[PDB]
Ligand binder design. Structure first.
Ligand SMILES: Nc1ccn([C@@H]2O[C@H](COP(=O)(O)O)[C@@H](O)[C@H]2O)c(=O)n1
Ligand SMILES: Nc1ccn([C@@H]2O[C@H](COP(=O)(O)O)[C@@H](O)[C@H]2O)c(=O)n1
Ligand SMILES: Nc1ccn([C@@H]2O[C@H](COP(=O)(O)O)[C@@H](O)[C@H]2O)c(=O)n1
Ligand SMILES: Nc1ccn([C@@H]2O[C@H](COP(=O)(O)O)[C@@H](O)[C@H]2O)c(=O)n1
Ligand SMILES: *[C@@H]1O[C@H](CO)[C@@H](O)[C@H](O)[C@H]1NC(C)=O
Ligand SMILES: *[C@@H]1O[C@H](CO)[C@@H](O)[C@H](O)[C@H]1NC(C)=O
Ligand SMILES: *[C@@H]1O[C@H](CO)[C@@H](O)[C@H](O)[C@H]1NC(C)=O
Ligand SMILES: *[C@@H]1O[C@H](CO)[C@@H](O)[C@H](O)[C@H]1NC(C)=O
Ligand SMILES: *[C@@H]1O[C@H](CO)[C@@H](O)[C@H](O)[C@H]1NC(C)=O
Ligand SMILES: *[C@@H]1O[C@H](CO)[C@@H](O)[C@H](O)[C@H]1NC(C)=O
Ligand SMILES: *[C@@H]1O[C@H](CO)[C@@H](O)[C@H](O)[C@H]1NC(C)=O
Ligand SMILES: [Mg+2]
Ligand SMILES: [Mg+2]
Ligand SMILES: [Mg+2]
Ligand SMILES: [Mg+2]
Ligand SMILES: [Mg+2]
Ligand SMILES: [Mg+2]
Ligand SMILES: [Mg+2]
Ligand SMILES: [Mg+2]
Ligand SMILES: [Zn+2]
Ligand SMILES: [Zn+2]
Ligand SMILES: [Zn+2]
Ligand SMILES: [Zn+2]
Lengths: 443, 445, 441, 443
């Protein structure tokens, strides 16, 4: 029946951790309390220097053993209560009751809101490591929940908390439930509530604005570190944490037609797909504006026919165009002389006998334009690459072209495009997805 | 179930604590371990400087809070396990079996012996603070004991251990069980054995001798601090820790006729009583051989009439003698010229206070027999000096004609005939039947 | 098998780790080999899929248990051999030759150079965390070293390696010996040599540039993360890793006149002292040219009298000046009308609160010299704010005294000067930082 | 409701005015909480009023009492405690709370009022140094603000402050309290209020006083030994010692490794041990100079002389180098190879086990020592045959230079700075290793 209060979410420049710890100490002078930090907080916390109150510094240090940063080693009790800064212990026995709430219930974490300006509300949460995405929403089975948002004391067993890979990664409210929801654990939000501190931290607009900013920075670094590129919400809100126009793309050059993320049993990072989708939309826009006749090719046509979007592990977009229209588009005229950075940042190059448009000078997510010319009613070209799907095809497949949803817009595809896709890939290609190179890595 | 190992019994100059602690760490790397020492052990213990292994220094220090020397602040777990030096954890999960045994059973402590040359064995023990006595014997209902002798891992709840007044006084083997047995607590000796250290401490004959010496000195200091004058064992073995012939008596000058121990709700220390009996016996023998007519007086006669022994809170022995007999006894003759130390170290002297003699056990220990000389006037025994006590009166000489034998303090003493009537005349009716402290207005039974 | 080969220093884009692994299995099929990486290396390594070869990915992951990112999990042997990329096992049975060497000797680490272009050289190393410095030099007791430079297989007991805080932090060649030297452990460089890979990694100038760019960035992040602000070779060729003119000072704002580094049981960062010496010399150079009578004051005069430098745990320089002299310095006159950033980046300010001047290293780095103006009153040096008054004869004359790399002026009889303001014996009894007492207050 | 608990700790059981003290405070508030603390039950009996707010707190372990019984805070329900010394009396109602209003309205954590005895409390300065095992008393420069008191004072502080010290009621309280509070930087403000003396004051005869002063001094000397105070000084002088000397053992035992016990307790060398080493160094030097042995400071002694002219504060021996061709001129030295030599002044001179050096110990029992290292000049370089210890050129000794050290003048090698850096490394004088307790804990 012994519970270690463990404090991790606080700002060194402005906290109420002294009040927090003293408030628990008034209910039990021998109360085990562990304040955790990456480095020594300054200005000093000035905690009581008694054996049951310890400061656990989790960063590596040349004069400290491995144990010194492993937090479970500061915790001897069966249960641990994560307490946010701004909380206060007043009524005695509140942790005893969360403990017997836990043993009675079936959720492996119980939680009690702190009566702050943002008391913990309950959230649904699915984590897709394969798609680098976490999706929150309202919780159907509240007070049974996957995740919380807001301030709460969270009690669970030390064996449960400290077997996680990142038990106290900040922000705790995000990092913890990402790991427990993935494991299928539930948090049950009890009806107990902890009081707020009497002199709460971040009392001024300047202080809380500095806290929020540093807090947004920790959260971004956390999600980047743990393979979450995108956080989405019921209602449509999106939080992006990956590549954009000014960065590089999220993965290096692709060997064996098998991108790095597949070997990590992951698919294309959602920010990379999104850059491809806007490059695709942009390139189609200037192609159509130039009167260049284009059509979805390769995996782009496949993904469009299969589910109207980029195949979730693909990393480029492929369009075929008529060779004799190439001249009508300015960017492409220039691309034959050299690389072309147009007024919107996209990079047009010729390299191969095809053209490539890159999202930006730094982000090399590309659209490939393959020019074909007709010879005896057969679309062909003069340079080949060793792939099953790089072949000639009858021109009647382009007479006419048909509207086909793709990557958020309506594209042009060959008529009878399922027959077209069967021609280049083999029978059943639409219904039988497979990785770009099953020889090395197969879905 | 989380259990803190707590090491309190070891010697800084030769121990196996590093191996003890490391052997528990090889079963659980985050095992909470608390080494408790009065002062920082030198040479260094060199325990792993890791957060789950702490060293509790229970000394006062100018730069530490009160909590620093209170061992409960170093234990966060619900159960704690006292582990003696020389024990090593072999079998994984030995303490988990101890915790569930304790919750299944009804004893507040459970114990596992360690496979040393002296594994813990079951003992009975009652403690009598009023008589400063601890009485050990064989355990009637083993494996449920009041106390153990020898090396054991003892597991209990921290709340129970650290509500004791001296949880880790040394030797813990003695200290712990006097406190738990006085509280009616049982220790269940389990059929679980911890292994001994592969390199046991005290390997040399010189170190064990040095180790036993500190232990015996620590043990004697413990019982003196706790009011245990006498430790008795079935089979009759007696260990004493009070006064003796060559020290001072246990208590100081008695004021108000009420000795210090009575206010502490204890009776006369067993060592003082024993000195008084052997002084009473010896003086009676001197007086008989010298031809001095004596009889038991005051509290000595009263105690004799009640149960043939000194009243359990009394501090002296009183005898009456015939004044015309003092010249018969060599020690009494010298006493009037000055204080005399005789053939056996007893000190005979005439008292400052009116006209009586006093025989002290030794020069240093002033437990004493008082010799009150009386002389007859008209068949009335009297003296020229009188203390201001109610039992200090004249009495008819016929009470002394003749004397009757009466057991007292292990020998047969001489007493007034009709000593009931004698005692009631001096103390008031019913004195024999109604024991009472020497001054009820200050401290009553 | 008593040794687990553990390879940590390699690059995903160009390596010879497959050759490395293969070479050791060709000598023993059962050889335990762990390739450690922060994330899954790409292009794939395609090492043998056997139980004794395991890839340890040490970064925390949402789907993995805590044990998965701890290197001791992947090692079940008594000894670990740290093998750098580019090494290769050619002769058989040299890892246990390295074991029999470790057993017999007194060093906790043994090492054998790899026959690369950069084979391991024996190095001396002392780590002072209180001075945030790593001092390297040639090894006086070679082949017994405190550190290596270059390619070597290093073998030590797995219990020793994985008990350190940062056992596999990169670069290993730097992180390992910063940890083991600090513990006073030694490394014995054997007369044994590992062959190089027959297809050595980073064979091109471009690959080597990419590797060194990344390796230098790792090294700088490691030194910062472990509080090594200065690295030196034989007292020279200094490499800095702390603050400078374009950053903030290392310790931020000071509360209770106790800077952060004291609570971390250290002295002033050496990059901060270097800035303080530079500002003291710059300000003294500016006062001497403007014709401003100054003298060292407080802890700078005490430092100068004791060892002729800034006291190694102090964080500012203090100078006394004549108040009537301030009008002769452009910055001082401008500082009284507001904050001044002069031609060389120092900011001269007139603290409204204390009635004194302050010259900071730069707009961002607030290490500062304090200027305290006195004016003569009836023979005594005084001011209107409050550190004591003192007779003027201490300044008639003023005396050359070495301090912080240059000759500054101090009160005459400065030992008596110091004794009056600080107490007798002050020069001989430094208040050494007291971490124990600082905890109590 | 009363907010102050009177606490009485300094009295003698054989002679006291505690019954009068207690009656005086109850005479002004019959519900006033009063606690009398003692190690054992005071005899002769105190016979205090058998009332619930008067309690005897017996502070020693007892076989039949709970832990709380020997803890003084158990006996105090108020925010404030007034330590009252025997001999004091409450004649003027209301002073207890004027001390409380004064404490609240001021900035010192303790306030005090003198008792109008023959020894009324005087204001003192006190800096404690655990590293140097010294308490340094002096006149209080900022009176009425003190670090310590001398004499009889009712001292009032918060219960929470007093009972969180390690030895709140250790005797004599006038020593133990202020050693602990001055160490923390706390201040005691001696108010301008006065308590009356007992109408029948305790210890009114010389014999009674003599008994009380002998017990007090014994408690004080035990208190300083237990607490690691080896030297009390008044205005830098009037030294009072509580450590080792010529007839005791030396404070630390046999040293293991190169680390004496005092280092692991985060202290430096005991001042008694430094004092005996200065006495021995001077004695040894005086003997060698009289006998005509060429000596010079060596090792850490030369380093201490160069740096600040004394033994380095955490060093435990003195080293001197001597010319071997000169040993025959010292009687104690020639006898030293025959065997151990106690000289006329108690110093023990012995030849090395096998190390080939001479050791002069302060006494047979106190093994603080000066080591004499003989060298000879092979080709102008100083050598010994078995072994900071290094060869060094002989010209450093031609000639020898005077150098102040340990309260006298000793001979040093010429250019001792260059010498020291050959021996220890560059800049050894200016950057002193003071012991790192953490690193030594790490090892
Ligand atoms: N049966 C198949 C065959 C290919 N594909 C995908 O279609 C894409 C074709 O790549 P290209 O656009 O380079 O032709 C690849 O991402 C490949 O994995 C698929 O999803 N199902
Ligand atoms: N009714 C009584 C009266 C006295 N006594 C005891 O008898 C003793 C008398 O002491 P003296 O005769 O030595 O003066 C005391 O120990 C006293 O307590 C008793 O046990 N019962
Ligand atoms: N006796 C002293 C007094 C100060 N010093 C140090 O020199 C500096 C002088 O203090 P101020 O800068 O506060 O004047 C402080 O770091 C101080 O502790 C010292 O090293 N020895
Ligand atoms: N830089 C250094 C090096 C050694 N020392 C001191 O030198 C002494 C060791 O030298 P000895 O072996 O000569 O005694 C120790 O007191 C040690 O603290 C020092 O105070 N500063
Ligand atoms: C989580 O996934 C489940 C599928 O099992 C789905 O029903 C639910 O809507 C998802 N919730 C969120 C917030 O995405
Ligand atoms: C993980 O769980 C196991 C089993 O409950 C436990 O033994 C271990 O200590 C846990 N790990 C921690 C607490 O780091
Ligand atoms: C682990 O490291 C710490 C160093 O801080 C040390 O005290 C401990 O004994 C080490 N344990 C082992 C087995 O080396
Ligand atoms: C403890 O008390 C019981 C009950 O009087 C008694 O039978 C038993 O003998 C006592 N124990 C000892 C060891 O004398
Ligand atoms: C004493 O027991 C009580 C339970 O009645 C518990 O709350 C308290 O913590 C215990 N005290 C110590 C010092 O362990
Ligand atoms: C490193 O420290 C040792 C300590 O004795 C010193 O003597 C040596 O000269 C130092 N070397 C360097 C390169 O600083
Ligand atoms: C106490 O410390 C101050 C500051 O170091 C010093 O000036 C003073 O003399 C010290 N007091 C005594 C009595 O030593
Ligand atoms: Mg494609
Ligand atoms: Mg393509
Ligand atoms: Mg009697
Ligand atoms: Mg009598
Ligand atoms: Mg300064
Ligand atoms: Mg300043
Ligand atoms: Mg020395
Ligand atoms: Mg020596
Ligand atoms: Zn991306
Ligand atoms: Zn006795
Ligand atoms: Zn810096
Ligand atoms: Zn000493």
């Amino acid at each position: 029946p012994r519970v270690t209060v463990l404090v991790r979410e606080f700002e060194a420049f402005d906290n109420a951790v002294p009040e927090l710890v003293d408030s628990f100490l008034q209910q039990d002078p021998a109360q085990p309390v562990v304040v955790a930090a990456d480095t020594l907080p300054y200005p000093p916390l000035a905690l009581p220097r008694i054996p049951n109150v310890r400061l656990a510094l989790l960063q590596p240090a040349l004069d400290r053993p491995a144990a010194a940063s492993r937090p479970e080693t500061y915790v001897a009790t069966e249960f641990v209560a994560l307490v946010p800064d701004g909380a206060r212990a007043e009524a005695p026995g509140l942790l005893e009751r969360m403990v017997e709430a836990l043993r009675a219930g079936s959720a492996r974490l119980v939680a009690a809101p702190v009566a702050t300006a943002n008391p913990a509300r309950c959230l649904a949460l699915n984590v897709s490591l394969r798609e680098w995405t976490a999706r929150y929403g309202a919780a159907p089975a509240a007070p049974r929940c996957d995740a919380l948002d807001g301030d709460a004391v969270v009690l669970l067993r030390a064996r449960d908390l400290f077997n996680l890979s990142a038990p106290l990664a900040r922000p705790v409210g995000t990092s913890l439930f990402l790991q427990t929801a993935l494991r299928g654990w539930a948090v049950q939000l009890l009806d107990l509530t902890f009081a707020a501190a009497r002199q709460p931290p971040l009392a001024t607009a300047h202080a809380r604005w500095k806290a929020e900013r540093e807090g947004r920075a920790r959260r971004a670094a956390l999600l980047r570190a743990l393979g979450i590129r995108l956080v989405s919400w019921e209602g449509g809100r999106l939080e992006w944490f990956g590549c954009n126009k000014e960065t590089t793309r999220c993965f290096g050059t692709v060997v064996g037609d098998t991108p790095a993320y597949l070997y990590e049993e992951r698919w294309t990072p959602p920010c990379c797909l999104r850059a491809l989708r806007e490059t695709a939309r942009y390139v189609v826009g200037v192609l159509e504006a130039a009167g260049v006749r284009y059509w979805l090719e390769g995996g782009s046509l496949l993904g469009a026919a299969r589910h109207g979007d980029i195949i979730p592990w693909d990393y480029d977009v492929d369009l075929g165009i008529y060779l004799e229209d190439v001249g009508n588009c300015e960017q492409l005229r220039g691309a034959e002389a050299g690389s072309v950075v147009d007024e919107r940042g996209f990079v047009w190059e010729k390299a191969g006998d095809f053209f490539r448009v890159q999202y930006s000078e730094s982000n090399h997510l590309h659209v490939d334009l393959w020019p074909f010319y007709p010879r005896n009613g057969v679309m062909t070209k003069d340079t080949w690459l060793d792939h099953r799907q790089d072949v000639e095809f009858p021109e009647h497949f382009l007479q006419p072209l048909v509207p086909l949803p793709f990557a958020g817009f309506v594209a042009q595809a060959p008529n009878n495009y399922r027959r077209f896709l069967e021609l280049k890939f083999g029978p059943g290609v639409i219904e039988n997805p497979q990785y770009p190179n099953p020889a090395l890595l197969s879905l």
